[PDB]
UniProtKB/Swiss-Prot annotation:
Monomer. This is Green fluorescent protein. It comes from Aequorea victoria (Water jellyfish). Changing residue 164 to T: In P11; increases fluorescence at 475 nm excitation and at warmer temperatures such as 37 degrees Celsius. In Esmerald; leads to brighter fluorescence. In VisGreen; leads to brighter fluorescence. Changing residue 164 to V: In P9; increases fluorescence at 475 nm excitation. In R10-3; matures to the red-emitting state with excitation and emission maxima at 555 and 585 nm, respectively. Changing residue 69 to A: Increases fluorescence at warmer temperatures such as 37 degrees Celsius. In GFPmut 3; highly fluorescent mutant when excited at 488 nm. Changing residue 200 to I: Suppresses the 475 nm excitation peak, leaving only the shorter wavelength peak at 399 nm. In H9; increases fluorescence at 395 nm excitation. Changing residue 66 to H: In P4; leads to no detectable fluorescence. In mut2.2; shifts fluorescence lifetime from 3.03 to 1.94 ns. In mut3.3; shifts fluorescence lifetime from 3.03 to 1.88 ns. Contains a chromophore consisting of modified amino acid residues. Maturation of the chromophore requires nothing other than molecular oxygen. Keywords: Chromophore, Luminescence, Photoprotein. The lineage of its organism: Eukaryota, Metazoa, Cnidaria, Hydrozoa, Hydroidolina.
Length: 226
């Protein structure tokens, strides 16, 4: 049993902190909850702490801890994310919304004490003011997706590629292309995986008594040799 695996054998508290700027509109999001990697399960509530969120909350889901994925027994040697812990890893993305702008993100995810922390900076540019994003034209829901993971031996890390489909109010879909790189923060050994996918399902809801702009999230993720 790996050092990293052991850290995730039980329920782990999670803190997420996001600092964003999209087309000059600045915002912060704070998240609190817990993860149970044994079940590939995340439960979190995110709050926009700067008032009204200038983008749709679903566009921030991928940015807002893949170390909580369930890796089946036969796939544990492919779990790069837990192998990097507790020192953690840097996770960077470019998220390109088709016919619209893009996010660039850089996050560090690591333990601070007993708490798994995801600290993110996000910059968004080239968005259309009457687009699906700044115009808030996305449905408040989320589709199931496969995240395809490949090793990046050069950087002692991984890369991932996937396309998120955001349901649009008119029946269309807003595509968000993700290109992702993860690299270890520490210089101890990590697990470099064979190609595989993370099958992820997420359910978005609201607290009817929460008056702040917010997002309640439940997520199930399991690795598949697929």
């Amino acid at each position: 049993k790996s050092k990293g695996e052991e850290l995730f054998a039980g329920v782990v508290p999670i803190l997420v902190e996001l600092d964003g700027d999209v087309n000059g509109h600045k915002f912060s999001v704070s998240g609190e909850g817990e993860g149970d990697a044994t079940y590939g399960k995340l439960t979190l509530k995110f709050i926009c702490t700067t008032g009204k969120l200038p983008v749709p909350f679903p566009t921030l889901v991928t940015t807002l801890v893949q170390c909580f994925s369930r890796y089946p027994d036969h796939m544990k040697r492919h779990d790069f994310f837990k192998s990097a812990m507790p020192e953690g890893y840097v996770q960077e993305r470019t998220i390109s919304f088709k016919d619209d702008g893009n996010y660039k993100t850089r996050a560090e995810v690591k333990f601070e004490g007993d708490t798994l922390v995801n600290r993110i900076e996000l910059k968004g540019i080239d968005f259309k003011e009457d687009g699906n994003i700044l115009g808030h034209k996305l449905e408040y829901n989320y589709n199931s997706h496969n995240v395809y993971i490949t090793a990046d031996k050069q950087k002692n890390g991984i890369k991932a590629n996937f396309k998120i489909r955001h349901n649009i109010e008119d029946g269309s879909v807003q595509l968000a292309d993700h290109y992702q790189q993860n690299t270890p923060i520490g210089d101890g050994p990590v697990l470099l995986p064979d190609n595989h996918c993370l099958s992820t399902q997420t359910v978005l809801s609201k607290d009817p008594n929460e008056k702040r702009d917010h997002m309640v999230l439940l997520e199930f993720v399991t690795a598949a040799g697929i």
